[PDB]
Motif scaffolding. Structure first.
Motif, PDB file in Angstrom:
ATOM      1  N   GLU C 307      61.522 -16.792 -10.852  1.00 31.77           N
ATOM      2  CA  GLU C 307      62.333 -17.944 -10.063  1.00 31.77           C
ATOM      3  C   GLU C 307      63.897 -18.077 -10.399  1.00 31.77           C
ATOM      4  O   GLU C 307      64.729 -17.798  -9.409  1.00 31.77           O
ATOM      5  CB  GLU C 307      61.710 -19.309 -10.598  1.00 31.77           C
ATOM      6  CG  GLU C 307      61.835 -20.516  -9.612  1.00 31.77           C
ATOM      7  CD  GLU C 307      63.314 -20.913  -9.411  1.00 31.77           C
ATOM      8  OE1 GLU C 307      63.561 -21.533  -8.491  1.00 31.77           O
ATOM      9  OE2 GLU C 307      64.017 -20.779 -10.476  1.00 31.77           O
ATOM     10  N   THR C 331      67.582 -24.431  -4.162  1.00 31.90           N
ATOM     11  CA  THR C 331      66.230 -24.423  -4.601  1.00 31.90           C
ATOM     12  C   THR C 331      65.236 -24.235  -3.509  1.00 31.90           C
ATOM     13  O   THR C 331      64.378 -22.992  -3.490  1.00 31.90           O
ATOM     14  CB  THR C 331      65.669 -25.775  -5.254  1.00 31.90           C
ATOM     15  OG1 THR C 331      66.274 -26.767  -4.462  1.00 31.90           O
ATOM     16  CG2 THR C 331      66.704 -25.923  -6.647  1.00 31.90           C
ATOM     17  N   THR C 334      65.377 -20.585  -2.707  1.00 33.23           N
ATOM     18  CA  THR C 334      64.509 -19.850  -3.957  1.00 33.23           C
ATOM     19  C   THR C 334      63.406 -20.059  -3.513  1.00 33.23           C
ATOM     20  O   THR C 334      62.606 -19.006  -3.745  1.00 33.23           O
ATOM     21  CB  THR C 334      65.270 -20.569  -5.333  1.00 33.23           C
ATOM     22  OG1 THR C 334      66.498 -20.888  -5.286  1.00 33.23           O
ATOM     23  CG2 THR C 334      65.160 -19.362  -6.221  1.00 33.23           C
ATOM     24  N   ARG C 335      62.712 -21.170  -3.325  1.00 36.22           N
ATOM     25  CA  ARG C 335      61.363 -21.399  -2.753  1.00 36.22           C
ATOM     26  C   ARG C 335      60.851 -20.385  -1.988  1.00 36.22           C
ATOM     27  O   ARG C 335      59.819 -19.778  -1.775  1.00 36.22           O
ATOM     28  CB  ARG C 335      60.770 -23.010  -2.835  1.00 36.22           C
ATOM     29  CG  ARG C 335      60.544 -23.452  -3.822  1.00 36.22           C
ATOM     30  CD  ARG C 335      60.149 -24.879  -3.487  1.00 36.22           C
ATOM     31  NE  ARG C 335      58.760 -24.664  -3.175  1.00 36.22           N
ATOM     32  CZ  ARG C 335      57.853 -25.777  -2.640  1.00 36.22           C
ATOM     33  NH1 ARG C 335      58.252 -27.056  -2.852  1.00 36.22           N
ATOM     34  NH2 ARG C 335      56.496 -25.642  -2.353  1.00 36.22           N
ATOM     35  N   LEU C 338      60.456 -16.954  -2.559  1.00 31.64           N
ATOM     36  CA  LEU C 338      59.636 -16.827  -3.727  1.00 31.64           C
ATOM     37  C   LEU C 338      58.294 -16.698  -2.908  1.00 31.64           C
ATOM     38  O   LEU C 338      57.490 -15.540  -3.060  1.00 31.64           O
ATOM     39  CB  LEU C 338      59.397 -17.842  -4.713  1.00 31.64           C
ATOM     40  CG  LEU C 338      60.306 -18.169  -5.813  1.00 31.64           C
ATOM     41  CD1 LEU C 338      60.115 -19.230  -6.536  1.00 31.64           C
ATOM     42  CD2 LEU C 338      60.330 -16.842  -6.745  1.00 31.64           C
TER      43      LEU C 338
END
Ligand SMILES: Nc1ncnc2c1ncn2[C@@H]1O[C@H](COP(=O)(O)OP(=O)(O)O)[C@@H](O)[C@H]1O
Ligand SMILES: Nc1ncnc2c1ncn2[C@@H]1O[C@H](COP(=O)(O)OP(=O)(O)O)[C@@H](O)[C@H]1O
Ligand SMILES: Nc1ncnc2c1ncn2[C@@H]1O[C@H](COP(=O)(O)OP(=O)(O)O)[C@@H](O)[C@H]1O
Ligand SMILES: Nc1ncnc2c1ncn2[C@@H]1O[C@H](COP(=O)(O)OP(=O)(O)O)[C@@H](O)[C@H]1O
Lengths: 407, 386, 391, 409
Positions: C307, C331, C334-335, C338
């Motif tokens: 992460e 974020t 980033t999600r 992922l």
């Protein structure tokens, strides 16, 4: 590389050490093994000055004179005057068009043999005055400014020294990296009236025995070509690289072409084109004919066979004939060079013999005459020996007359 | 190289009126008039399919007239002087020799931008600076020690036209304009020069055809674009009688092309058998070529013109001569060839320097005459021996 | 185009101790240290007849590791990144394509001769004239020009203005303070292919090929000439072949040939397939590679991303894109990185930036991210829904 | 002519010097760089005998066994036992059908490299024991039965002497007609328990230093082919070799052509190999395979043992290869370490042995270099268990790597 030079051709003019003319310009009667031919001698001096002035712009020299008047001798004297190691390549035109090979290639090699290279290389040699010559690993003492040095040599190096006739008090240099002894001379300590400074009585070496001497090797392009055996061109490129590096100074020589009247017009054009270049050596001709017909034309007749084009760029130097006195002097000089003791009456008979036929015939008569004298147990040659030799061997003119006379 | 580098034109004034001594030519008024007629014929372009052959005995300026005509055609018109015997060479066949001779005469004037470092020198600044003024501006343009030495070699301080990082030239003190005269110098490069470029002991130790084709294509392209300018020159073939029938046919073929330069030949025989075949013909030339030939005859030389010619030559060779020496040289040149007379000069100069003199005397001339034999004497003396 | 434009070496140093951030590269410490081992192997020259294969799922830095290795070997070491399918072209055969790839990976540091006439300009001399130049040796006013003096006047005068051959003028310091007319060995890593292109005759050539063999022969002879002379020092580069499993069995044998030469560059390969069909044959082999090549293979496995590492990598990229975004936007990206590939996250970045400018903002918010996320989809979603239509 | 051999391919098996079987026929546990493989080893010595009996008429050898069990090593040992200089040309079948060249030509050069030529020529060499080594024109004293000779050499030859590591008291031959110094060995005067006669302590030369020695030059046919360089010259080079043999100086010595991964060879290729081995001059072709009854490549329907078509298999002498247990695995890896020069603890070797069982003996062997290099950085001369464990955690193996990728899938 082995020196590729026709030693026999130039051996007959070994007494010639230079042009033998003074600083003023006129030539003395006898000097540097040259007798007479004062006019041609001064002309050759002028040509030498022109060559050293680089004013020989696309020009050549034609030596005209009857057979046996020292044309080849004068060419050799010019070559000597330009430098002791300046290349000299004599050649008679009758051998350009050999049965095999190619006229272009023959002239090519002749030109090559006339262009030299002064390769000056710094090698640590053993330049020292031989104080003692102990042959045991041959620790020979070489006294110099540093002092005597018992440098251990090898039996091969000692044999080389013996071949150089090196004795005590002989200032010699022994190139250490190649183990070759070359007799420079003796010491100045024993210099007398004839023995002087910086010659066969060279002075004491100043410096350490092992000194980086700038040794100059005299070698022409052709020797390299024969050593490397297109291939010819590759040798040229390496030579150019050497000169560019800064150790090969080009020195143009002299190309002496005898019997020029019997050369093809194509060969004449090739020679013209070769001499056009700046690096070209001096091309010196020699002829005995008059207005003989050009070779490959059959109808145009031009002086000495040379086509008018080349001959318009030519400096003609005439060579005179020798009177009995000069003939006798020259014969005696040649005998001295050969180590021959000859009586004055024999020299006179030889001079009258030469007057009829040629100087070549008189000079050639010496060796058989000396052998005949040796057989009879006499150390010298008398008039009887010369008479017998003349009655034994003939000359072309007389024998031809004999053959035709019977006809 | 060198030879007769003193004529920059025919010197025939205007309306074909030779003004005697002028730009070298100091005689041969008839031949000069004919050469001028030929030149302006070439200018007007009605000499196509013709040639000029200059007859006359040796030493009458046959090559001088051709050089003068070449100069008069243009300041940079190519001139190629070869000899008839020059073609039968060992490396090249007569075909290749004549092709090279022709391409030597076809010059290409191609522009080339260059930043000539020029300026009217107002002060001769010494490696260092050098004040230079132009219409663009004035500043102290820097030069090297040798560049300023050459500036002093030229007339100071007129000029100077110092090409970029190169030598200078005297004009007046006045080359002006831009301090960067970005002038496209029109370099006259002959076809053969380009050919050799595309292709230093090479003469001591011939070009295929592809290089030739590429050269032709590139030169044609440049000329068409407007960068180059094909300007046919003059090709001079001395000793034309030496040429054979086969080379004469090739000459005839080559004269047919559009790029063919003006062909000049020189001969001094008359009624000589053609080298090829076994048929006698004037000057040994096949009649097919003689029909279309403009013939110019050079008359023999007289004493005053010979003396003037010698004066010019000594002026060229930096030699001062006594008047008696000049008269003796003139009489020699009349009794022998002019070429021998010119040869005499350089040897006399060194003879004079041997005695550490400043001007050559008659004594030096006679000493060198006795020293070096000439054509006629050497033969006479040789045959008498035989 | 501009990816991996921040991987300047492996950034571990410290006797093979990878730092979290170092110079751009963050994460994948395991594979980083293994790369360091290979780097020393290249220096020591004990990698001959060997190759490196980086296995791992897509978007884990396998290409970035290769870029770092070339930078770590040297600032100017050639790098060639090609795809396995890049060899199947109609113009060139597999031989020509692979031959070209090897060539451009072979770099030559030709020490070009440059007579650098530099010197602190004491006075800007107008102009074709000269220019007062001075160094520590002497003040040698030197030759100049107008278009050049125009450049000098257009430059900072006087600030040294280091002049090389009358082309460049470095206005750094008053630093041209050596020899006025000095000499320089200009480093120039011209790829063997680059020499080939110069010789090749042929601006629309890409629209309206194959280098001739004779051209190859000539430059090979030339390169030997300079190499013997001492100007050219052949530098073995790094050749990276992505999607190696795409290559077929015939190409694999060619790689064996090219890897047994003294000019052979270090070969680095990457693939994310397990035991698959060997192209051009009817067998199954790990990574789709013939056993002969696999035996002598330095295989390094790139671990998937964590992460925080993804967030840090994004931070670096935005600095290159000149994009300022909120932490919540960070974020969400980033999600995205992922659940989907990292590349898809980068693609969103630039698109979202124009979104921010559309509303005349400076900092991209979470609102923009969702706006572009719905606009342009990821390959998984497009394929997922789009097969749904099929059934 | 420069030798053309993949030194790297055979480099891994330099510890092997031969089969290492006794006169009785049985094979000892460890000999001449071979550990274990008794059943296979005793077999190979047999074929060497049939090769020496000239009863290998139209036959070949197929080496079947798992990966990393010495299939290449046993083939190398066969060449060594038949002769130290007997050519050995390994090859993998996957490299026959390359993008370029031609399958015929590829199989061509492979066969050529498998044929040697024993060209013995009497050349006057300088065979003598070094008494003194004065390098000044390098007059080296060479004492022989005639006596010590201070032979004048050249600095270039002196550099060759240094390249061969020639010191005082070494009986060596220096080709006078070629100016090359070759280290035959030392002198028997200093022979000790390990230094023996006619070896690296070769005895005192009997005869004049300048003795014409019939020197043998070991060169393969392909070496000449590459030296004389298109194609079709191949025939002429064959002509010259035939002429040399006829004169009576080049004794032809067939070698061994090793063909690994034979299961992936086209049926057309198999036919060519069959025809080649039909000739008497043909070298022994030794196959190697690790599959079972894989279907022939060029048929897609007919399955035959190890891919080989039934015709060829009917003439094949298959040699089986066993597996290595921890003990043999540890022993072999230790021998490899000594050959290159690594000091390794027994515990580290034990871990390396268990590594070999999981993946291969190849993988364990390759791990030595990075492990010893890693220990060098830490300033340690010997590799410990920690270094092996760390290197295993840095670099992976094919099987584990594939499993990891599939597991994630
Ligand atoms: N001027 C001279 N001075 C000294 N010796 C000479 C002179 N001229 C000729 N000789 C000698 O006479 C010789 C014969 O000359 P020769 O070879 O016939 O000259 P060429 O044939 O070139 O005219 C030579 O062997 C030479 O030693
Ligand atoms: N008109 C002229 N003016 C000046 N010098 C001339 C003139 N004509 C010839 N000369 C010079 O006279 C010399 C002999 O003439 P040249 O042109 O060689 O004769 P030809 O070509 O007829 O054989 C040369 O040096 C030449 O330059
Ligand atoms: N160590 C790292 N540091 C910074 N960014 C990285 C790192 N590793 C990977 N990246 C990012 O991930 C991407 C790597 O490309 P990647 O997908 O690995 O190539 P491949 O096509 O071989 O999978 C790059 O866009 C890069 O920005
Ligand atoms: N009998 C043996 N004795 C000693 N070492 C061996 C033996 N067999 C194999 N080895 C070693 O194990 C190695 C790996 O075997 P490998 O090359 O995979 O054989 P194969 O040809 O069966 O695949 C070689 O590097 C070799 O040094």
């Amino acid at each position: 590389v082995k020196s590729t030079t026709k030693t026999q051709r130039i051996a007959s003019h070994s007494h010639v050490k230079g042009l033998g003319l003074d600083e003023s310009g006129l030539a003395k009667q006898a000097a540097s093994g040259l007798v007479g031919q004062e006019n041609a001698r001064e002309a050759c001096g002028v040509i030498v000055e022109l060559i050293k002035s680089k004013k020989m712009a696309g020009r050549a020299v034609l030596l005209a004179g009857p057979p046996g008047t020292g044309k080849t001798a004068l060419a050799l004297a010019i070559a000597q005057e330009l430098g002791s190691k300046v290349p000299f390549c004599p050649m008679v035109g009758s051998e350009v068009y050999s049965t095999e090979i190619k006229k272009t290639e023959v002239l090519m090699e002749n030109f090559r043999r006339a262009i030299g290279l002064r390769i000056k290389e710094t090698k640590e040699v053993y330049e020292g005055e031989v104080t003692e010559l102990t042959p045991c690993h041959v620790i020979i003492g070489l006294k110099t400014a540093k002092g005597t040095k018992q440098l251990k040599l090898d039996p091969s190096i000692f044999e080389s020294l013996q071949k150089e006739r090196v004795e005590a008090g002989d200032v010699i240099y022994i190139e250490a990296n190649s183990g070759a002894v070359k007799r420079q001379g003796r010491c100045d300590t024993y210099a007398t009236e004839f023995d002087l400074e910086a010659e066969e009585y060279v002075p004491l070496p100043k410096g350490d025995v092992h000194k980086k001497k700038e040794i100059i090797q005299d070698v022409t392009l052709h020797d390299l070509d024969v050593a490397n055996a297109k291939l010819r061109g590759e040798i040229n490129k390496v030579v150019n690289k050497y000169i560019d590096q800064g150790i090969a100074e080009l020195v143009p020589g002299v190309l002496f072409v005898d019997e020029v009247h019997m050369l093809d017009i194509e060969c004449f054009t090739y020679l013209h084109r070769a001499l056009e270049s700046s690096i070209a050596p001096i091309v010196i001709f020699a002829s005995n004919r008059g207005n003989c017909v050009i070779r490959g034309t059959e109808d145009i007749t031009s002086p000495h066979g040379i086509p008018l084009d080349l001959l318009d760029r030519v400096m003609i130097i005439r060579t005179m004939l020798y009177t009995p006195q000069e003939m006798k002097q020259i014969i005696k000089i040649r005998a001295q060079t050969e180590g021959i003791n000859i009586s004055e009456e024999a020299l006179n008979h030889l001079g009258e013999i030469g007057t009829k036929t040629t100087l070549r015939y008189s000079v050639q008569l010496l060796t058989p005459a000396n052998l005949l004298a040796k057989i009879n147990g006499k150390d010298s040659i008398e008039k009887e020996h010369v008479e017998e030799i003349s009655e034994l061997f003939y000359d072309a003119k007389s024998s031809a007359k004999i053959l035709a006379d019977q006809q | 190289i060198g030879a007769h580098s003193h004529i920059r034109g025919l010197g025939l004034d205007d309306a074909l009126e030779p003004r005697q001594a002028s730009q070298g030519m100091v005689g041969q008024l008839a031949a000069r008039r004919a050469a001028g007629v030929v030149l302006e014929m070439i200018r007007e372009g009605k000499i196509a399919g013709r040639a000029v052959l200059i007859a006359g005995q040796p030493g009458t300026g046959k090559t001088a007239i051709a050089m003068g005509m070449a100069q008069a055609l243009g300041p940079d018109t190519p001139f190629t002087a070869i000899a008839g015997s020059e073609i039968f060479s060992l490396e090249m066949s007569k075909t290749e020799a004549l092709t090279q001779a022709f391409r030597r005469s076809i010059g290409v004037r191609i522009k080339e931008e260059t930043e000539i470092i020029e300026g009217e020198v107002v002060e001769i600044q010494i490696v260092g600076k050098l004040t230079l003024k132009t219409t663009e501006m004035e500043t102290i343009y820097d030069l090297g020690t040798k560049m300023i030495e050459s500036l002093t070699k030229d007339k100071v301080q007129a000029g100077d036209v110092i090409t970029i990082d190169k030598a200078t030239g005297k004009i007046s003190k006045c080359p002006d304009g831009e301090l960067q005269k970005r002038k496209e110098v029109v370099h006259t490069v002959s076809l053969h020069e380009i050919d050799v470029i595309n292709s230093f002991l090479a003469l001591f130790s011939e070009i295929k055809s592809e290089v030739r084709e590429q050269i032709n294509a590139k030169v044609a392209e440049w000329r068409e674009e407007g960068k180059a300018e094909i300007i046919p020159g003059v090709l001079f073939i001395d000793e034309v009688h030496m040429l054979d029938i086969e080379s004469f046919s090739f000459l005839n073929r080559a004269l047919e092309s559009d790029m063919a330069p003006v062909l000049i030949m020189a001969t001094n025989r008359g009624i000589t058998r053609i080298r090829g075949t076994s048929y006698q013909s004037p000057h040994g030339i096949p009649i097919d070529l003689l029909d279309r030939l403009l013939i110019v005859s050079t008359t023999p030389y007289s004493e005053k013109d010979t003396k003037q010619i010698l004066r010019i030559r000594c002026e060229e060779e930096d030699v001062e001569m006594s008047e008696d020496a000049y008269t003796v040289l003139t009489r020699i040149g009349l009794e022998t060839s002019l070429r021998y007379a010119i040869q005499l000069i350089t040897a006399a100069s060194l003879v004079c320097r041997k005695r550490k003199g400043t001007e050559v005397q008659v004594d030096d001339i006679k000493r060198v005459y006795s020293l070096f034999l000439d054509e006629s004497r050497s033969t006479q003396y040789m045959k008498e021996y035989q």
